Amino acid sequence: DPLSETKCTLKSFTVEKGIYQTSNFRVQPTESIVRFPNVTNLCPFHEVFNATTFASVYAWNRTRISNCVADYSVLYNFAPFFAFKCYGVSPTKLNDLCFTNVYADSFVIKGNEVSQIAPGQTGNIADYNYKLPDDFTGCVIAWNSNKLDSKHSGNYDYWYRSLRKSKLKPFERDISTEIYQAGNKPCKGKGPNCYFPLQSYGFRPTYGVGHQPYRVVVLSFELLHAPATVCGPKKSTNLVKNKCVNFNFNGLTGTGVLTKSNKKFLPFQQFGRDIVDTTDAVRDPQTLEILDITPCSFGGVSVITPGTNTSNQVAVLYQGVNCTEVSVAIHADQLTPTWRVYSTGSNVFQTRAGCLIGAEYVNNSYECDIPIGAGICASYQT
Amino acid sequence: SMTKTSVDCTMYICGDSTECSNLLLQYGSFCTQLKRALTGIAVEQDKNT
Amino acid sequence: CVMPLFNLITTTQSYTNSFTRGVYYPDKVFRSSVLHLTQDLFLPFFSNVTWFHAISGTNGTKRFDNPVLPFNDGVYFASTEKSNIIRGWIFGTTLDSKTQSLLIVNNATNVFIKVCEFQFCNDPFLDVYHKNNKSWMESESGVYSSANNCTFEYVSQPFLMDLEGKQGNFKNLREFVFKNIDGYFKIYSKHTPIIGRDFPQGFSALEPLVDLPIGINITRFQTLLALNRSYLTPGDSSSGWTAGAADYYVGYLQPRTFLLKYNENGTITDAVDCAL
Amino acid sequence: AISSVLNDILSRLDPPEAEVQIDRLITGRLQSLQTYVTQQLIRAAEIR
Amino acid sequence: AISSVLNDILSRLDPPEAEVQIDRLITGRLQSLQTYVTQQLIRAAEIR
Amino acid sequence: TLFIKQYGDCLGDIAARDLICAQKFNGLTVLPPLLTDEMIAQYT
Ligand SMILES: *[C@@H]1O[C@H](CO)[C@@H](O[C@@H]2O[C@H](CO)[C@@H](O)[C@H](O)[C@H]2NC(C)=O)[C@H](O)[C@H]1NC(C)=O
Ligand SMILES: *[C@@H]1O[C@H](CO)[C@@H](O[C@@H]2O[C@H](CO)[C@@H](O)[C@H](O)[C@H]2NC(C)=O)[C@H](O)[C@H]1NC(C)=O
Ligand SMILES: *[C@@H]1O[C@H](CO)[C@@H](O)[C@H](O)[C@H]1NC(C)=O
Ligand SMILES: *[C@@H]1O[C@H](CO)[C@@H](O)[C@H](O)[C@H]1NC(C)=O
Ligand SMILES: *[C@@H]1O[C@H](CO)[C@@H](O)[C@H](O)[C@H]1NC(C)=O
Ligand SMILES: *[C@@H]1O[C@H](CO)[C@@H](O)[C@H](O)[C@H]1NC(C)=O
Ligand SMILES: *[C@@H]1O[C@H](CO)[C@@H](O)[C@H](O)[C@H]1NC(C)=O
Ligand SMILES: *[C@@H]1O[C@H](CO)[C@@H](O)[C@H](O)[C@H]1NC(C)=O
Ligand SMILES: *[C@@H]1O[C@H](CO)[C@@H](O)[C@H](O)[C@H]1NC(C)=O
């Protein structure tokens, strides 16, 4: 009850007369909604997983995945997953979020160079054949391919680039086979100061595990920047307005009330923002309707007590909220503090500081004792 | 006198987040102090007027 | 690749101020009645641009001005014409089939975007001429020889663009902004009626139009001109390929901090540079 | 951290990994609140 | 941090790992600046 | 020219969102002065 909350707040078993601040009431949501696009066709990860050949790192295969539903459960169906580590995104949470553009990249990497596929890594492979961005926000699955890409005579079909004037910027592809020049002497062919940049792995099945070939698939998804088209298989429910609910709009979680919008979104925009840079309006992916997002009512709670020695009666002041909203939330059992003060019609008073519940409003005027706010004071009188 | 402002920590720092709220208790009383200071300032404003 | 013999004229590059044009929406996020300070690749205020012209003379000499211009970090393209001589642009580094290139062709009924290892001619152009003396049609044979290793084909935008008429001057104030993102190529456009003769003083936001996730390398850009086999200027008996008057301006982007003013209503109404 | 919205970090990360981002944002916001309270206290002294 | 010179950390380390040390130095110098400003404000009130 | 008045409702964001409404939505509330300006005027 509020008096016990005040006792906890003061860390004392006796409460002196006054008004104390205890906690912050909050209208808790009732339902939870999810709105996801109509797309149902499954993205074809197996095709880039059933790639009969893997391109060389210097010209690594790159494919885009979009306009489909992504089910990352098929990744676990693959057996080896030698290195399954996701940057910036929980591998378990992969099934719920929504990504705009998914980029899938595949290649065959050196056995001990797997750890070099990471932001800012040092080494030949890191900054001469394949460079990841420093702000990588995707996932990557690596596994050995010795029993698929090893020949007894040696695999010379795959190559890497080792000689070049400058290191490669992240996500840059170099395919030229021009000779390398050392110093200032011009180069016209194989010889001094001129070497072929491309060298072969020379993979052999007899080589050790650290020397074994390794197939790697890179799944780099860019985060929420509005035009989301690749979404998880989470089913969508009906939309409810004018009720504090937990929404999930295309991967944007939160809690607030939804209503029709008078703001006119232009066709390209997806969701609006506040001046303080908080999400304010969201366009419904299915019905293409623009809705506001207003957080459910809250505010501080102040307990007015005449002193625990005089009496145990208390009066609660719900700061900055109309009595209509507080009464509706109490009737719907939504307020976070669950010690509802008894209301008998005449125990509800609407001050400019908030809603006063538990105190009767008289028409008289005395030298006020307990200050509430905006010219209103409370006291214990017969 | 000046405007009396009261600020709620948990809503400002970890607004509607059980995990962040639990992680906030590890910082001791860095919020009872803020609430006490702001309440004292507000009472002082009323006393000034 | 068939090019008729023409009295080619060396390109004239007149210089003019850029005024306040070149403001586009940095992102899809909607804001209203805010003063947003942003850092992006804008066009610096009161900058200088390379003004080209393209016309066919009455003396048998036709000005064929399609030089090769650096892309750097961006290009602000503004065009104004009557017969839509500027039918597209070509993007690349070495302009050959060795590396992939980006090409855009206006079909006058739709907009074509092809990104392949095209093999262009010395002066590629779109062949538009009459068929059976009844209809106008265009051909892409004169631009590229063959297409190989195609990675992105796009056919959309069934809009004729200039349709209101030619009230002020062809009503064809057409502005484009091309940004060479690491994995994107963005196009922003806006069509405005003429106020004056050319390059009026005013402000107009550039809403995004089409997004391309090609993720290719671009270093150079070139513009394509429409060549019609006569039958354009009345009273002219010269049976040869003629091109109408064409004017366009290219501005170069730079990393600048702007201050966009979204109104209380949705659209950008004003912007202020932070280093002018 | 990786995002300024706690809901995004909570949704996109496992709890043990999200602890670090949550703690970084907590430190930043606590520093901001401390600065605001100190400035308010000095202004309150001047106003008094 | 490893060193008190920004250029040394920048040159000797790759960007992603040096981010942590640069953030540590940034936090330290920000705390120093905020402490200086706070004491200046208090002394300004006393002098006023 | 100036706070709380009766801002418990944000008018349903009829015309964008004001600064005060945005501040209120993240634990930033303004308590009203104890003496309303009518009482200050009466004292004066
Ligand atoms: C990567 O390899 C694939 C074949 O494994 C190439 O062909 C693509 O195949 C996928 C299905 O596996 C199709 O959806 C694509 O349309 C194909 N692309 C084509 C035909 O251009 C693919 O081209 C290769 N990509 C690179 C960058 O080398
Ligand atoms: C703001 O956008 C609205 C979209 O309706 C435009 O408001 C209309 O303005 C005209 C011209 O004054 C009025 O006749 C209409 O009654 C308005 N409609 C409303 C208010 O719903 C308005 O033109 C835009 N303002 C600009 C572009 O400056
Ligand atoms: C991938 O591998 C086998 C052949 O190696 C093929 O039969 C199978 O269908 C493929 N997987 C999927 C999911 O299509
Ligand atoms: C793009 O091509 C240019 C010109 O050849 C070259 O200098 C540059 O390094 C290339 N950039 C990338 C990212 O491949
Ligand atoms: C999704 O389906 C609904 C009807 O179920 C339709 O109104 C809406 O336009 C669809 N959205 C698309 C096709 O993007
Ligand atoms: C643009 O170039 C011309 C070349 O003569 C130069 O005079 C002019 O100042 C330039 N404009 C700006 C804004 O620097
Ligand atoms: C242009 O559109 C016509 C139909 O209007 C179509 O048949 C043709 O293939 C398109 N492309 C051209 C002519 O390059
Ligand atoms: C297309 O790809 C093939 C196969 O890698 C390659 O040999 C060829 O040079 C590329 N370009 C063209 C124009 O065919
Ligand atoms: C509360 O309801 C009363 C009675 O209609 C009204 O006068 C007052 O403005 C309302 N306040 C809010 C915040 O809705």
Side-chain angles (χ1 to χ4, degrees):
Chain A
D1 45 345
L3 186 50
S4 311
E5 225 188 292
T6 306
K7 287 180 187 171
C8 288
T9 293
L10 307 163
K11 318 275 283 209
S12 100
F13 254 84
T14 179
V15 178
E16 304 115 319
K17 166 163 64 41
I19 164 174
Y20 307 89
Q21 207 139 335
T22 79
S23 47
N24 282 251
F25 86 101
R26 179 178 305 104
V27 172
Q28 295 284 349
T30 73
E31 329 190 33
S32 317
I33 77 160
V34 277
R35 302 314 305 284
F36 270 42
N38 304 0
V39 192
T40 77
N41 34 63
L42 282 309
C43 310
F45 315 83
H46 52 284
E47 321 283 352
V48 317
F49 283 8
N50 284 57
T52 169
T53 57
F54 267 55
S56 282
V57 176
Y58 67 78
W60 73 99
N61 185 289
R62 158 155 271 186
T63 168
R64 65 167 293 102
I65 297 198
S66 48
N67 302 320
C68 56
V69 159
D71 179 20
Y72 294 85
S73 72
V74 309
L75 315 185
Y76 309 100
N77 307 344
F78 208 50
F81 26 69
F82 145 79
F84 181 32
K85 161 219 53 56
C86 295
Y87 283 171
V89 165
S90 156
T92 77
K93 292 304 198 70
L94 216 34
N95 223 8
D96 324 314
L97 325 159
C98 284
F99 332 101
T100 75
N101 41 348
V102 202
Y103 264 50
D105 283 26
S106 60
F107 40 72
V108 155
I109 210 59
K110 168 71 201 181
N112 73 333
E113 282 175 7
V114 154
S115 61
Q116 283 209 37
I117 83 159
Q121 278 305 316
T122 169
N124 45 11
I125 172 64
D127 47 64
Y128 264 100
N129 323 126
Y130 194 90
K131 178 71 173 189
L132 277 174
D134 295 331
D135 39 338
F136 191 14
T137 173
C139 192
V140 47
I141 313 103
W143 75 100
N144 68 323
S145 70
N146 38 317
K147 69 158 311 303
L148 281 293
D149 295 69
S150 299
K151 289 167 184 165
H152 208 311
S153 53
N155 298 68
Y156 311 99
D157 320 325
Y158 329 136
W159 303 71
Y160 28 70
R161 173 180 290 100
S162 89
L163 256 47
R164 200 184 159 263
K165 305 295 165 328
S166 61
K167 298 175 299 314
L168 313 180
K169 55 213 302 203
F171 273 16
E172 158 183 34
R173 158 143 28 84
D174 194 3
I175 211 167
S176 181
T177 58
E178 263 278 349
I179 213 79
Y180 181 81
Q181 175 180 318
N184 295 343
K185 298 194 175 184
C187 278
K188 296 185 178 184
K190 197 187 174 183
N193 312 294
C194 321
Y195 263 52
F196 189 40
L198 295 197
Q199 269 58 60
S200 156
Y201 303 87
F203 279 137
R204 305 185 163 275
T206 56
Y207 285 159
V209 185
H211 281 265
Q212 273 178 6
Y214 271 82
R215 269 173 184 203
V216 174
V217 47
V218 154
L219 272 179
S220 158
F221 27 69
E222 159 278 0
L223 285 172
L224 167 74
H225 295 321
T229 204
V230 196
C231 275
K234 177 164 318 291
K235 106 163 276 197
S236 44
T237 78
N238 187 28
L239 165 140
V240 47
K241 294 197 228 43
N242 318 86
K243 232 176 293 299
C244 167
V245 285
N246 311 275
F247 47 79
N248 188 338
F249 277 114
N250 222 318
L252 164 63
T253 328
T255 293
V257 85
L258 301 192
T259 166
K260 271 299 281 294
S261 57
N262 50 42
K263 310 187 301 222
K264 39 181 219 152
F265 276 32
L266 281 53
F268 65 105
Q269 314 148 308
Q270 261 321 103
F271 63 73
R273 279 257 195 75
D274 216 337
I275 164 174
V276 305
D277 257 310
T278 53
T279 293
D280 180 39
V282 168
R283 163 193 304 276
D284 181 8
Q286 302 216 1
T287 79
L288 278 275
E289 192 31 88
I290 322 93
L291 326 158
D292 299 24
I293 285 191
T294 290
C296 328
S297 285
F298 47 65
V301 164
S302 302
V303 168
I304 292 109
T305 166
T308 207
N309 55 0
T310 314
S311 179
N312 302 269
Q313 298 189 67
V314 301
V316 169
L317 159 83
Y318 289 111
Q319 274 153 352
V321 54
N322 239 16
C323 298
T324 312
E325 322 280 5
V326 157
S327 268
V328 154
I330 278 176
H331 212 69
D333 312 70
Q334 297 186 234
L335 284 206
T336 288
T338 331
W339 34 249
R340 278 118 185 71
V341 171
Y342 207 49
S343 161
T344 54
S346 93
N347 267 4
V348 188
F349 185 38
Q350 176 76 56
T351 56
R352 263 192 71 242
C355 188
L356 195 61
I357 296 197
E360 185 38 89
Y361 182 53
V362 315
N363 267 333
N364 314 136
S365 296
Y366 322 133
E367 197 67 41
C368 94
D369 189 14
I370 316 190
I372 289 176
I376 295 280
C377 278
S379 277
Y380 195 56
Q381 159 290 339
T382 321
Chain B
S1 56
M2 79 204 197
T3 295
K4 322 195 305 182
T5 69
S6 206
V7 176
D8 182 19
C9 283
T10 325
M11 185 107 65
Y12 173 76
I13 307 178
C14 305
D16 174 35
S17 170
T18 288
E19 294 85 358
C20 193
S21 157
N22 278 354
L23 288 211
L24 193 56
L25 276 295
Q26 314 295 80
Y27 288 78
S29 55
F30 274 144
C31 276
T32 319
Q33 306 175 29
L34 272 44
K35 233 178 73 195
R36 261 201 289 269
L38 291 189
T39 294
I41 290 176
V43 173
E44 177 195 300
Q45 293 326 294
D46 285 336
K47 178 196 95 211
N48 290 348
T49 279
Chain C
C1 293
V2 180
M3 49 303 312
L5 285 166
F6 296 130
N7 284 342
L8 301 193
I9 307 177
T10 42
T11 312
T12 85
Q13 323 194 60
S14 316
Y15 295 32
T16 190
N17 66 45
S18 72
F19 271 22
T20 67
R21 329 204 45 95
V23 163
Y24 64 94
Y25 290 63
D27 38 34
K28 329 265 297 167
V29 165
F30 168 78
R31 327 201 167 75
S32 263
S33 36
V34 309
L35 261 286
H36 197 46
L37 175 101
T38 167
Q39 183 293 350
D40 207 87
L41 301 199
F42 285 102
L43 183 79
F45 266 9
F46 291 86
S47 194
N48 84 337
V49 313
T50 326
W51 180 18
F52 305 93
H53 332 97
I55 208 174
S56 303
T58 53
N59 297 357
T61 64
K62 302 138 210 175
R63 176 173 168 169
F64 213 67
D65 288 4
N66 42 338
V68 157
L69 314 97
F71 205 78
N72 285 340
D73 320 82
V75 152
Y76 158 78
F77 196 104
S79 210
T80 283
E81 51 202 323
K82 45 179 166 168
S83 318
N84 315 319
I85 309 304
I86 323 282
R87 294 277 165 171
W89 321 284
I90 169 186
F91 297 77
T93 68
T94 54
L95 307 186
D96 52 350
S97 67
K98 291 184 186 170
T99 68
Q100 298 193 340
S101 99
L102 159 69
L103 182 157
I104 287 100
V105 152
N106 201 305
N107 196 27
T109 46
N110 277 86
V111 169
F112 293 175
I113 299 164
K114 323 194 177 166
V115 190
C116 319
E117 300 163 2
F118 292 97
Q119 188 47 55
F120 333 120
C121 326
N122 48 39
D123 309 303
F125 80 104
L126 278 160
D127 171 29
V128 47
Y129 62 112
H130 270 306
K131 188 169 174 179
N132 305 337
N133 277 346
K134 284 174 188 184
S135 62
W136 277 110
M137 48 88 171
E138 203 160 36
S139 171
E140 312 169 23
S141 66
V143 202
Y144 54 110
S145 55
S146 70
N148 308 125
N149 309 1
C150 275
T151 182
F152 187 149
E153 216 290 329
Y154 194 12
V155 168
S156 279
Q157 304 161 228
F159 196 38
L160 301 106
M161 301 274 177
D162 170 55
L163 283 158
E164 57 255 42
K166 334 277 164 302
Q167 286 90 322
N169 196 14
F170 316 139
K171 312 248 98 173
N172 207 234
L173 232 306
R174 211 174 88 150
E175 305 186 87
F176 293 60
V177 182
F178 311 137
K179 309 183 46 181
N180 52 295
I181 327 291
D182 188 55
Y184 271 101
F185 169 108
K186 313 217 190 74
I187 312 194
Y188 310 76
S189 323
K190 158 72 59 151
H191 292 40
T192 311
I194 317 280
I195 308 181
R197 159 118 198 162
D198 279 309
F199 229 70
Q201 188 165 4
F203 187 76
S204 33
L206 267 292
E207 76 186 30
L209 208 62
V210 172
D211 255 330
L212 258 51
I214 38 184
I216 72 156
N217 189 353
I218 318 107
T219 309
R220 226 66 50 83
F221 121 89
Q222 191 256 29
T223 166
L224 323 165
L225 289 307
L227 280 187
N228 300 70
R229 298 186 215 209
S230 82
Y231 294 129
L232 311 183
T233 47
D236 202 354
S237 57
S238 69
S239 52
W241 305 54
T242 75
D247 292 321
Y248 68 100
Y249 325 85
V250 42
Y252 274 60
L253 304 194
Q254 256 207 351
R256 293 297 200 78
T257 297
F258 262 49
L259 183 94
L260 323 162
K261 169 184 186 353
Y262 303 81
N263 54 13
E264 55 94 25
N265 185 347
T267 84
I268 298 183
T269 183
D270 212 332
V272 157
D273 203 339
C274 304
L276 172 67
Chain D
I2 76 195
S3 212
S4 75
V5 152
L6 288 189
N7 296 317
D8 271 15
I9 292 175
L10 280 196
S11 294
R12 305 194 346 234
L13 270 64
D14 331 74
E17 256 283 354
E19 309 292 285
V20 175
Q21 318 294 314
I22 294 281
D23 230 317
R24 200 157 295 145
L25 277 190
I26 287 173
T27 295
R29 280 160 192 182
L30 257 175
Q31 257 193 58
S32 322
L33 266 178
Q34 219 77 43
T35 299
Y36 167 74
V37 168
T38 293
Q39 311 277 294
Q40 275 299 103
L41 272 165
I42 298 157
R43 287 216 203 91
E46 172 214 23
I47 288 288
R48 194 218 326 118
Chain E
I2 317 146
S3 173
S4 71
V5 152
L6 230 285
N7 295 307
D8 193 291
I9 316 193
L10 261 206
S11 295
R12 201 228 68 66
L13 270 87
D14 56 60
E17 176 80 339
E19 291 290 292
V20 170
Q21 327 292 56
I22 292 329
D23 202 289
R24 195 136 32 166
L25 273 196
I26 276 189
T27 299
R29 287 167 186 185
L30 249 172
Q31 242 186 0
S32 320
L33 257 182
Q34 222 144 130
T35 305
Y36 162 79
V37 167
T38 292
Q39 316 283 18
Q40 277 305 102
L41 283 162
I42 288 160
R43 209 139 75 208
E46 157 185 339
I47 289 292
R48 198 221 318 117
Chain F
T1 36
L2 256 49
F3 257 178
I4 170 155
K5 265 298 159 295
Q6 204 52 279
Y7 264 29
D9 69 329
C10 269
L11 292 73
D13 308 4
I14 177 72
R17 180 91 65 70
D18 270 356
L19 252 308
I20 306 103
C21 263
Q23 300 190 325
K24 156 139 50 73
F25 287 152
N26 328 112
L28 304 182
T29 326
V30 160
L31 315 165
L34 172 57
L35 288 147
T36 175
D37 301 52
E38 163 81 354
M39 306 200 145
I40 311 288
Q42 265 195 273
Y43 271 137
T44 284

